[PDB]
CSV table of C-alpha atoms in Angstrom, one decimal:
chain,number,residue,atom,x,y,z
X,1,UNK,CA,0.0,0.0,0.0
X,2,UNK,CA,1.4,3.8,1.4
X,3,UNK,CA,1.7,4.9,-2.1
X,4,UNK,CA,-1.7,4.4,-2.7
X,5,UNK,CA,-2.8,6.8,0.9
X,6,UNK,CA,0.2,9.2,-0.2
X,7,UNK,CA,-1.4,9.4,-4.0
X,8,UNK,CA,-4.9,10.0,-2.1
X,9,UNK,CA,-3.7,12.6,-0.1
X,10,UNK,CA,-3.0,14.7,-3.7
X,11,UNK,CA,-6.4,13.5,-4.9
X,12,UNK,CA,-9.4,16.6,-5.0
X,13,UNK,CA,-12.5,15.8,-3.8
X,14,UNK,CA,-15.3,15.5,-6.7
X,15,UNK,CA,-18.7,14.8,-7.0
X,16,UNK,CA,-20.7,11.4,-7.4
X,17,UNK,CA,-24.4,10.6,-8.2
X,18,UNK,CA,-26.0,7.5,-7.7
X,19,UNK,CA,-29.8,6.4,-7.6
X,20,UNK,CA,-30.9,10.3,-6.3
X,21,UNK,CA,-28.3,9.5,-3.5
X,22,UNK,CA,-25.0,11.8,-4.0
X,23,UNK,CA,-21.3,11.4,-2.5
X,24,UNK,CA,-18.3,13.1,-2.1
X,25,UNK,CA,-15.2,11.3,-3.0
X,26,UNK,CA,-11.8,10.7,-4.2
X,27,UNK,CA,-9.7,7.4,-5.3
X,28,UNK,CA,-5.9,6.6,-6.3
X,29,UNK,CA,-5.2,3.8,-8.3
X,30,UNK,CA,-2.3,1.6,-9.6
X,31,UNK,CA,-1.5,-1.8,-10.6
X,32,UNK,CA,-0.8,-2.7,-7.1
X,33,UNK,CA,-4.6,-1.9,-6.0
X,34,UNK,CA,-6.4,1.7,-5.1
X,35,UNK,CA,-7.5,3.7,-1.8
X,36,UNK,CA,-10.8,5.0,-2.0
X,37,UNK,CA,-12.7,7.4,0.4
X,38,UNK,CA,-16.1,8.4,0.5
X,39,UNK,CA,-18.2,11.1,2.9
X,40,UNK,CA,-21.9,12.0,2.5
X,41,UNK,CA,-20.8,15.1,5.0
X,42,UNK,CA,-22.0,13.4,7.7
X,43,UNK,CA,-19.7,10.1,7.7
X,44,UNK,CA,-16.4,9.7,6.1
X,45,UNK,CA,-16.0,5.9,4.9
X,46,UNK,CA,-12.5,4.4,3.7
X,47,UNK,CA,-11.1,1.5,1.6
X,48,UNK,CA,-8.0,0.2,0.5
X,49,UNK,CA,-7.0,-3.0,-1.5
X,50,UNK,CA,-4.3,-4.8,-2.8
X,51,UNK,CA,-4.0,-7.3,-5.5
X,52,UNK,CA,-4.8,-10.3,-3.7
X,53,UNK,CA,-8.2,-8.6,-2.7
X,54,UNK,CA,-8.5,-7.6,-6.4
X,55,UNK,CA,-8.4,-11.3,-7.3
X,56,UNK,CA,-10.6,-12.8,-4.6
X,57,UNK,CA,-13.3,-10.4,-5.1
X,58,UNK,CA,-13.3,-10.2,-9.2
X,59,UNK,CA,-13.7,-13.8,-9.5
X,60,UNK,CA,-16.4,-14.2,-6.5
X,61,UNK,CA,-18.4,-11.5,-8.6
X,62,UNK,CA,-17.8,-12.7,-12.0
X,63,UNK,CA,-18.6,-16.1,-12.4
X,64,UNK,CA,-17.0,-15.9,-15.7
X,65,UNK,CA,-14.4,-13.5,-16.2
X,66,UNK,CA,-10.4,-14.4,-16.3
X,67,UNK,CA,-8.2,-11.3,-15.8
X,68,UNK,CA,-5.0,-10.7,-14.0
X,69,UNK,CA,-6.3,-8.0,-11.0
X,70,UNK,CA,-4.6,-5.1,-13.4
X,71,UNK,CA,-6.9,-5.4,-15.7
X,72,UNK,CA,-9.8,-5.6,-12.7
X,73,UNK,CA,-8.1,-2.2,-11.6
X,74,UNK,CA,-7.2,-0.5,-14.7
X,75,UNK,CA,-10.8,-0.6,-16.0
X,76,UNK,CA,-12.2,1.1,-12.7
X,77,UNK,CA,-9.7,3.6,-12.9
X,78,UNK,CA,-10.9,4.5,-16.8
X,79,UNK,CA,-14.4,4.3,-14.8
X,80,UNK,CA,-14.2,6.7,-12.0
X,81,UNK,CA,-11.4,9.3,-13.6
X,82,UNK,CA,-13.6,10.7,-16.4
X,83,UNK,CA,-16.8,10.4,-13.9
X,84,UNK,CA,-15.0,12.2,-11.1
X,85,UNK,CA,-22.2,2.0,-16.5
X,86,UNK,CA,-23.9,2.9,-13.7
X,87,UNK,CA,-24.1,2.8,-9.6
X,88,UNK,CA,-25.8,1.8,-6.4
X,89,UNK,CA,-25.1,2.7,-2.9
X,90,UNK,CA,-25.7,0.4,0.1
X,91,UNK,CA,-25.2,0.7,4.0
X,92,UNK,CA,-24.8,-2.2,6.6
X,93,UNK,CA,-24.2,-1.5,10.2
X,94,UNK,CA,-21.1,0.5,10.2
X,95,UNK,CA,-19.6,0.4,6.3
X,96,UNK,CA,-20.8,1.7,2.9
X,97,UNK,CA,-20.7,-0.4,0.3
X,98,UNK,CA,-20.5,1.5,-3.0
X,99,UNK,CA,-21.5,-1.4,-6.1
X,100,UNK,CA,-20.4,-0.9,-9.6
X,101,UNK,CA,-21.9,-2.2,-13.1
X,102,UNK,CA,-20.5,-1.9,-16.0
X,103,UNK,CA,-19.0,-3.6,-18.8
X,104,UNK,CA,-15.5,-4.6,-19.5
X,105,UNK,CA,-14.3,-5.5,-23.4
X,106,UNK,CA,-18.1,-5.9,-24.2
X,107,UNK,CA,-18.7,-8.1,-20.9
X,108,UNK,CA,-20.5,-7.0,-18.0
X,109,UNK,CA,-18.4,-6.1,-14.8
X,110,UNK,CA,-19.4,-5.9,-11.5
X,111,UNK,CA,-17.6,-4.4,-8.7
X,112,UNK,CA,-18.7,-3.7,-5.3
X,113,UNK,CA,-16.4,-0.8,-3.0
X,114,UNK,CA,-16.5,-2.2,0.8
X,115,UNK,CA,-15.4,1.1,2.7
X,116,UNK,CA,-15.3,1.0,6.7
X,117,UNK,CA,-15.5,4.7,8.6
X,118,UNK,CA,-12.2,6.2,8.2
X,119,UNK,CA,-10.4,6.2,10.7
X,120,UNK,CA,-9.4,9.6,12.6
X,121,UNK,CA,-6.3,10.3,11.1
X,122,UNK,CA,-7.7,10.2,7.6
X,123,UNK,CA,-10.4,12.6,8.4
X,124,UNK,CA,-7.8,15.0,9.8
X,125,UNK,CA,-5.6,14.5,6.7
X,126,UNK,CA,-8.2,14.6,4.4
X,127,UNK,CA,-11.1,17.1,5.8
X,128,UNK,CA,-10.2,18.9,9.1
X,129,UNK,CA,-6.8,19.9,8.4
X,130,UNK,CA,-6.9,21.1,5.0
X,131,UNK,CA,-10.2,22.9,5.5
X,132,UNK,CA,-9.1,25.0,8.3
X,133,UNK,CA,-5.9,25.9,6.3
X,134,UNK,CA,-8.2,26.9,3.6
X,135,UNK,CA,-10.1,29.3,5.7
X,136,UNK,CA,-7.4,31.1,7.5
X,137,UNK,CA,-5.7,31.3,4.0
X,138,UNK,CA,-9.4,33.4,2.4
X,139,UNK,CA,-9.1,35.1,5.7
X,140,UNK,CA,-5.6,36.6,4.1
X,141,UNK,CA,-6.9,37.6,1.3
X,142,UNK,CA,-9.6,39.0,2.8
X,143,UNK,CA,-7.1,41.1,4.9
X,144,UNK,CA,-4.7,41.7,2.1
X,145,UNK,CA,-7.8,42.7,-0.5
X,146,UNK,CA,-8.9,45.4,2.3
X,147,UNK,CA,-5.9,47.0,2.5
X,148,UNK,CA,-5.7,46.7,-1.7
X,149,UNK,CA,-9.1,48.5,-1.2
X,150,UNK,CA,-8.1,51.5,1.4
X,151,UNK,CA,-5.0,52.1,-1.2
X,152,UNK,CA,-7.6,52.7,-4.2
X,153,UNK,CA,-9.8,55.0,-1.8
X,154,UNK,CA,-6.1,57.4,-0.7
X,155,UNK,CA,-5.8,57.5,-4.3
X,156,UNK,CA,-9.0,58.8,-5.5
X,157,UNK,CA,-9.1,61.3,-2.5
X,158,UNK,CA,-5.9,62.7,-3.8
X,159,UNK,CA,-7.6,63.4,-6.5
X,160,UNK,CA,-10.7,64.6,-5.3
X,161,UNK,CA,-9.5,66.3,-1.9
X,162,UNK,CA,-6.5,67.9,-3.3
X,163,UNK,CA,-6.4,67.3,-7.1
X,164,UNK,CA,-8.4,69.4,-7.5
X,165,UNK,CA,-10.9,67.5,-10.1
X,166,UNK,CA,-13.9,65.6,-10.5
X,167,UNK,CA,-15.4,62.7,-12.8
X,168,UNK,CA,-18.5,61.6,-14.9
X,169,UNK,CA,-19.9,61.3,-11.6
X,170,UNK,CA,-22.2,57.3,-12.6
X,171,UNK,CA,-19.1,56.1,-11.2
X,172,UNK,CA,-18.2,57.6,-8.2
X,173,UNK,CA,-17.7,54.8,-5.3
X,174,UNK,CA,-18.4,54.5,-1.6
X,175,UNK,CA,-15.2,54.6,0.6
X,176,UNK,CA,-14.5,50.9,1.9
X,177,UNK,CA,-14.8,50.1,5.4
X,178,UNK,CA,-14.4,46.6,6.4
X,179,UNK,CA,-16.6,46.9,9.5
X,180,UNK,CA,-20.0,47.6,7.6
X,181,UNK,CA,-19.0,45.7,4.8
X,182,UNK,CA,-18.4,42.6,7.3
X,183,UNK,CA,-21.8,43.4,8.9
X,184,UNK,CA,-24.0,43.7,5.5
X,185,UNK,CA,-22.0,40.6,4.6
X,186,UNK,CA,-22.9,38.4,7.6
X,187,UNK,CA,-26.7,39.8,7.7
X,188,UNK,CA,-27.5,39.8,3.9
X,189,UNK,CA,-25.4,37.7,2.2
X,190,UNK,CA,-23.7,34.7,4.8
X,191,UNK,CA,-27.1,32.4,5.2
X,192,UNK,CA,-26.8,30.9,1.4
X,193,UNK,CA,-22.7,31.4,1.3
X,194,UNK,CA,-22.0,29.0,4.4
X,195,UNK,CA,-24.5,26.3,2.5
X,196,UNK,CA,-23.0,22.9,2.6
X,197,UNK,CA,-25.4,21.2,0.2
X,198,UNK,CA,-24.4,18.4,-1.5
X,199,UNK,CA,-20.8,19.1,-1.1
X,200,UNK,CA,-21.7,20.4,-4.7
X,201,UNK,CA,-20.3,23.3,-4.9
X,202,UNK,CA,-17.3,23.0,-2.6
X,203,UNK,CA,-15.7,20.7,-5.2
X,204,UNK,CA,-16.5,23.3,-7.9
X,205,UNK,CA,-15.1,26.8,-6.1
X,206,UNK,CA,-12.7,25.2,-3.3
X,207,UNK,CA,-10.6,22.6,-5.0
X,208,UNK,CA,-8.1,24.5,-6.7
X,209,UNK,CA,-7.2,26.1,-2.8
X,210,UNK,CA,-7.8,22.5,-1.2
X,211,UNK,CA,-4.7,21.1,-3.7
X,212,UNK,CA,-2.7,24.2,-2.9
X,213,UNK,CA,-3.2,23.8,0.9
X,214,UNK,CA,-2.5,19.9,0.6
X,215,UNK,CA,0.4,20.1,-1.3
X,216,UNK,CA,1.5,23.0,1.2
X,217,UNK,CA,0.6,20.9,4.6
X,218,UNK,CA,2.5,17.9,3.0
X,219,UNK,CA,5.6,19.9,1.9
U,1,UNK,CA,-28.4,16.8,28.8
U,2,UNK,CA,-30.1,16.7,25.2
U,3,UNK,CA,-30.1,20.7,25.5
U,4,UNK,CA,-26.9,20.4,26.4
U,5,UNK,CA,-25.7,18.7,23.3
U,6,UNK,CA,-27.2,21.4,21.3
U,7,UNK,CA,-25.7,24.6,23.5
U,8,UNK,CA,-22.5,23.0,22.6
U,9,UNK,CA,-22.8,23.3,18.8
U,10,UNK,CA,-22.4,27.4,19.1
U,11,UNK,CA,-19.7,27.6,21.7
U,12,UNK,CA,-16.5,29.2,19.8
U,13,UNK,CA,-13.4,27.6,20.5
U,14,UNK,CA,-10.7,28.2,23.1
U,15,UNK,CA,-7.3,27.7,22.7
U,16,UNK,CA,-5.8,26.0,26.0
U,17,UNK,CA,-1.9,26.1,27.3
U,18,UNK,CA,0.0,22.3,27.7
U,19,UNK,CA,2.8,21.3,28.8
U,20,UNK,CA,4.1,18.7,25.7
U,21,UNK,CA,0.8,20.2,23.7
U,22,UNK,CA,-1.4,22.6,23.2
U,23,UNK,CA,-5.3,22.1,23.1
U,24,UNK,CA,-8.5,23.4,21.3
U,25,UNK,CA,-11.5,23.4,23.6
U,26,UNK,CA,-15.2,24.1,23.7
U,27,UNK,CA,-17.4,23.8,26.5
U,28,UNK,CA,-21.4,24.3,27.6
U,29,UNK,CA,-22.7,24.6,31.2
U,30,UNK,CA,-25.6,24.8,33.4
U,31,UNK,CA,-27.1,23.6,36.3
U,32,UNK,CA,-27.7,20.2,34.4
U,33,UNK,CA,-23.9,19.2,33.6
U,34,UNK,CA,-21.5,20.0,30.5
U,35,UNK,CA,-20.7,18.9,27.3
U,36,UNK,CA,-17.0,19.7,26.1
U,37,UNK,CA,-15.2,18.8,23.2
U,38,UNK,CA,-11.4,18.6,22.8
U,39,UNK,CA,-9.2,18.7,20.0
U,40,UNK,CA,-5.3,18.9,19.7
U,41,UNK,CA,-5.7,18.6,15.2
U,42,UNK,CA,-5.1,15.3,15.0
U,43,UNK,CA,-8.1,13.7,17.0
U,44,UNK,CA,-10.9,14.7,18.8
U,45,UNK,CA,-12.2,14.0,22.4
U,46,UNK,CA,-15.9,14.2,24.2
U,47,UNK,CA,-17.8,14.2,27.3
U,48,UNK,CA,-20.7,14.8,28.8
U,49,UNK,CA,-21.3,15.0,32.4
U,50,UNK,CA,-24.9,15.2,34.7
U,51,UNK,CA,-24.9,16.6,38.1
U,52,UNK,CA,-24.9,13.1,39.8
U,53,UNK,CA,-21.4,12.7,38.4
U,54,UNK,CA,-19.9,16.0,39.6
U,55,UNK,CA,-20.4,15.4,43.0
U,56,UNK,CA,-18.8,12.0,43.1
U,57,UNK,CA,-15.9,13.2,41.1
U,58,UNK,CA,-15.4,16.4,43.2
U,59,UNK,CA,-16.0,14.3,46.4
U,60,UNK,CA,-12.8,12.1,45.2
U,61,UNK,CA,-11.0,15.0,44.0
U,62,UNK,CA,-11.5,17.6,46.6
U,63,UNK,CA,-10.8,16.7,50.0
U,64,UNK,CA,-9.9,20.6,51.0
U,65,UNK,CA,-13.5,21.2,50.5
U,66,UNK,CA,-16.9,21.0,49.0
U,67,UNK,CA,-20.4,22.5,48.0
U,68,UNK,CA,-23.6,21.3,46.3
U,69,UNK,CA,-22.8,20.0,42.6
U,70,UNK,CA,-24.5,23.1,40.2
U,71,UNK,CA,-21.9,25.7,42.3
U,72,UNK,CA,-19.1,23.8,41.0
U,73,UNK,CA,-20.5,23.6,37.4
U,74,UNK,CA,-20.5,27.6,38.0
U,75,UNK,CA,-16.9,27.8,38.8
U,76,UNK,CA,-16.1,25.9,36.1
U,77,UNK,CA,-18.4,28.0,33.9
U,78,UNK,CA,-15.8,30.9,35.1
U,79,UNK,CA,-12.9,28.8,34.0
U,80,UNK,CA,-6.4,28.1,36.0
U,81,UNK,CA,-3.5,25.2,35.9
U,82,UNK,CA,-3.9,22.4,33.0
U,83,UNK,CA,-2.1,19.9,32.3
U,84,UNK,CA,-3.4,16.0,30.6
U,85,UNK,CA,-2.3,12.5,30.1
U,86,UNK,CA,-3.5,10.0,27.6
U,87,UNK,CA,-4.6,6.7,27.9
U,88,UNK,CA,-4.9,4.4,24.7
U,89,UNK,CA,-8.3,6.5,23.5
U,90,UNK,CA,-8.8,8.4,26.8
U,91,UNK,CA,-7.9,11.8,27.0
U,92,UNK,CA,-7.9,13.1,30.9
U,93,UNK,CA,-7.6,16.8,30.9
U,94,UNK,CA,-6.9,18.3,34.9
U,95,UNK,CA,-7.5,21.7,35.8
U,96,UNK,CA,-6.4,22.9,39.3
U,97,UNK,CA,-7.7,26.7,40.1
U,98,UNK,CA,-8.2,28.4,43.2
U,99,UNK,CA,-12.4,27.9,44.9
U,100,UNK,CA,-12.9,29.8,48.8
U,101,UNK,CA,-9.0,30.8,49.1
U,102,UNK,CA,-8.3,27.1,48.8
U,103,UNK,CA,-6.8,24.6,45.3
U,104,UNK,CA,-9.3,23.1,43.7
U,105,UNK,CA,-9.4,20.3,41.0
U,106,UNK,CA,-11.4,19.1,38.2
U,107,UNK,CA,-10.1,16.3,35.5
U,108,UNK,CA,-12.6,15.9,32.2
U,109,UNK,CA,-12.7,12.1,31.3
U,110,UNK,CA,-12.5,12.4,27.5
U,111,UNK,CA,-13.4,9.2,25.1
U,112,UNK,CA,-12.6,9.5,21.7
U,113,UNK,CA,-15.4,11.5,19.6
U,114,UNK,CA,-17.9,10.2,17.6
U,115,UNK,CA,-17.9,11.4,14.0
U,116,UNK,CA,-20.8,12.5,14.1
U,117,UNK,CA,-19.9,15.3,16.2
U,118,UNK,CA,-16.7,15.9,14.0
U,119,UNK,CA,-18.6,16.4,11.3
U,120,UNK,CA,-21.2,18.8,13.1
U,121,UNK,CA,-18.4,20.7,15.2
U,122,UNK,CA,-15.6,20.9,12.6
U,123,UNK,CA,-16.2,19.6,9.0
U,124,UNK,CA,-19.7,20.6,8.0
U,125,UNK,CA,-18.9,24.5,10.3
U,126,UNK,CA,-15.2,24.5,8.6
U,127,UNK,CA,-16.2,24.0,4.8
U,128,UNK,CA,-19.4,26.1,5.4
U,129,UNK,CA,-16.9,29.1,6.6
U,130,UNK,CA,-14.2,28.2,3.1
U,131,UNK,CA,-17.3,28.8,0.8
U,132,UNK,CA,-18.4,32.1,3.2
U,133,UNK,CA,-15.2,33.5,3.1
U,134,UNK,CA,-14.6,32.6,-0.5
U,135,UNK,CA,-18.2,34.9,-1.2
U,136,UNK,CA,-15.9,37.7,0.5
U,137,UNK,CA,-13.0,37.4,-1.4
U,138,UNK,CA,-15.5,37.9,-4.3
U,139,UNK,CA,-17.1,40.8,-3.1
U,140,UNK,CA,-13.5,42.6,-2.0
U,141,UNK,CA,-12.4,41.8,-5.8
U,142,UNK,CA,-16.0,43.4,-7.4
U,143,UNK,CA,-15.4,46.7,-5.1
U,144,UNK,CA,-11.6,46.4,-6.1
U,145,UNK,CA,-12.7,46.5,-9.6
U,146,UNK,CA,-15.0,49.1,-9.3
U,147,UNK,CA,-12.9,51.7,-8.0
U,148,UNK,CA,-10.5,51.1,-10.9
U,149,UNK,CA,-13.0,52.4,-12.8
U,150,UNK,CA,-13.6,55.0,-11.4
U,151,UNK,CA,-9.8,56.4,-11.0
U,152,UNK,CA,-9.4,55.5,-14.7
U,153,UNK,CA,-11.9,57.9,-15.5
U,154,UNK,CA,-9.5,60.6,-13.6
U,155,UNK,CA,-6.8,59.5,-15.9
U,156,UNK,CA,-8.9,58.9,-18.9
U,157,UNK,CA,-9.1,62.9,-19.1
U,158,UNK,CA,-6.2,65.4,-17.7
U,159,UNK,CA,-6.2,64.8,-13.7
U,160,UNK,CA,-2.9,64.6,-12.1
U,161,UNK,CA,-1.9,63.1,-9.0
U,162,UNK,CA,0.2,65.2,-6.7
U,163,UNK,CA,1.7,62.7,-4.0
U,164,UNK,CA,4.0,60.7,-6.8
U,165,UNK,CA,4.0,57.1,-4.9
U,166,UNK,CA,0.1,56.9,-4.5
U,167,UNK,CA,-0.4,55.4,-8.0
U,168,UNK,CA,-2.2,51.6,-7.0
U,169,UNK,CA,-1.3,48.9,-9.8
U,170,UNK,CA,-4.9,48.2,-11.3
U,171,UNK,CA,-6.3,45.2,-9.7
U,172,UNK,CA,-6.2,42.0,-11.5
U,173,UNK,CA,-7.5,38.8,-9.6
U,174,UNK,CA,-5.6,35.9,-11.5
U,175,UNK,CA,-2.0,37.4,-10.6
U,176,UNK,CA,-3.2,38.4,-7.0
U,177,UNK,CA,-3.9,35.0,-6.7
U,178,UNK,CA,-0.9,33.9,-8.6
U,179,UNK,CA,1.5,36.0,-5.5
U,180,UNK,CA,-0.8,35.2,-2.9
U,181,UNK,CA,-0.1,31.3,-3.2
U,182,UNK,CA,4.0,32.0,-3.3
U,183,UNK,CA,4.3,34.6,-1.1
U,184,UNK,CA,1.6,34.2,1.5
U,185,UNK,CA,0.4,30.3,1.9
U,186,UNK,CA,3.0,28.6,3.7
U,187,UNK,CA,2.5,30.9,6.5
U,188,UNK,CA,-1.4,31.6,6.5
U,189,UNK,CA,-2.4,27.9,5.8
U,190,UNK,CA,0.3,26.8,8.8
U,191,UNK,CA,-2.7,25.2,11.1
U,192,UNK,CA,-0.1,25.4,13.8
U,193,UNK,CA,-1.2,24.7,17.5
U,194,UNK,CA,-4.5,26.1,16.4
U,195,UNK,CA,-4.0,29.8,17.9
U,196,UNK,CA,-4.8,31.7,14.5
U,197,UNK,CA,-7.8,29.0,14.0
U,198,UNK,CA,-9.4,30.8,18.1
U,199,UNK,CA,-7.5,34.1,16.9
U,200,UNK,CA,-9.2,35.5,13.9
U,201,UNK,CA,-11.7,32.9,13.1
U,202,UNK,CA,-14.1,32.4,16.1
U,203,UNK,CA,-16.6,34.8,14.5
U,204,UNK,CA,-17.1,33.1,11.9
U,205,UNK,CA,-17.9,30.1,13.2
U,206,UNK,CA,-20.1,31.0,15.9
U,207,UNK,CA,-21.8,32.1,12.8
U,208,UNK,CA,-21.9,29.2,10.7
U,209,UNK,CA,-22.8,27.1,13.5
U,210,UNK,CA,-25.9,29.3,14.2
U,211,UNK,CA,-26.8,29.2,10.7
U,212,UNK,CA,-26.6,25.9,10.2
U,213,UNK,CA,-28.4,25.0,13.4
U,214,UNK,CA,-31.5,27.3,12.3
């Protein structure tokens, strides 16, 4: 394994559909097997395999395929990269079991993902960690984008307060104050901004910063 | 104790002083008991205490003294000397203050947290401030664009500047971002011993948490 948890580590999180049921999740595979992990942002579920697993399981689900486990794991990664055939999503007790069908050189594959809750670590290295790097991170730019802002309002004072000159006047902005805009922020606007949802849109306006604070955290 | 499961959700956190660590804590009391989570950014540790355990603990704890259970709960709501050991999943934090001129002690048996309340005290609050925040940086760049225009109008047509070092660089996102993420990061993405995470963050989340809750 380890490269396979080290290669998950650089993985985004994406987005998954299945039978109305959504997911978010990420997966790093090679010819020596894959890590998977899965959260429905309320439980964070984890597998890993190896090729012996690969084996056992292919053949107890195919009752009529022959395949070294590469080819088992090389045609779920050309599955779940594009993606990231059709699938299903299961719970027993304590695991998620995320099933798989689909077709393989013109004969149907099945594949079912047995992921266990993740284990603490994992959910600090792959959620909590990373997310609170994020936000103290915005919180910079925040700080460094207010400041941008009070040196574009000392400039335009210079030119109104001692310039001497005016403008077209349909264009003329407020002076920025990061206390009322902070305040009309977190009364008007922070109720649909702080919306979780399907873990939608986090993977669609957050990833490019998760990666950057990963690779960061990790180097 | 249900209510006191739910009190605990909007608590900010505090950051506490170890000897080998540092810790993040949260805590909710009343006459009932407390709820506190604990988290040193690797794990996280919970417990939940009624009144009928308070006065056994502080009767094994406190021989110098004692008093009916709920005044102790109120001391503690006051809340000092911590330090903690850790047993296999067991986290027991000790405090040792100062109660009627006299030491006084209190240890918080901690198990290891469920997810469940990872996910509704960290994860789901945490990503729910990134995409808040991220809504700010939008609104900063918006206004930064907008007053572009309007000082380009002043150099569209004659208007001169008389302090010569006032001039801003016009303000262009992709390249902001493109410095930010060399020269700022490392340092603001550092998670640390958590101190920025209760320094400039705590306002945020108690407003998450309350929006989420409603």
């Amino acid at each position: 394994m380890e490269e396979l948890e080290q290669g998950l580590l650089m993985q985004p999180w994406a987005w998954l559909q299945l039978a109305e049921n959504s997911l978010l999740a990420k997966v790093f595979i090679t010819k020596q097997g894959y890590a998977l992990l899965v959260s429905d942002l309320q439980q964070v579920w984890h597998e890993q395999v190896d090729t012996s697993v690969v084996s056992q399981r292919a053949k107890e689900l195919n009752k009529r395929l022959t395949a070294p486990p590469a080819a088992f794991l090389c045609h779920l990664d050309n599955l779940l990269r594009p993606l990231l055939a059709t699938f299903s999503c299961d719970c027993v007790a304590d695991a998620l079991i995320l099933r798989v069908r689909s077709e393989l050189s013109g004969l149907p594959f099945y594949w079912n993902f047995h992921c266990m809750l993740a284990s603490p670590s994992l959910v600090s290295q792959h959620l909590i960690r990373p997310l609170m790097g994020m936000s103290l991170a915005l919180q910079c730019q925040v700080r460094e984008l207010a400041t941008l802002l009070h040196m574009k309002d000392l400039e335009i004072q210079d030119y109104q307060e001692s310039g001497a000159t005016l403008i077209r006047d349909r264009l003329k902005t407020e002076p920025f104050e990061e206390n009322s805009f902070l305040e009309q922020f977190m009364i008007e606007k922070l109720p649909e901004a702080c919306s979780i949802g399907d873990g939608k849109p986090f993977v669609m306006n957050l990833q490019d910063l998760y990666m950057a604070v990963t690779t960061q955290h990790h180097h």
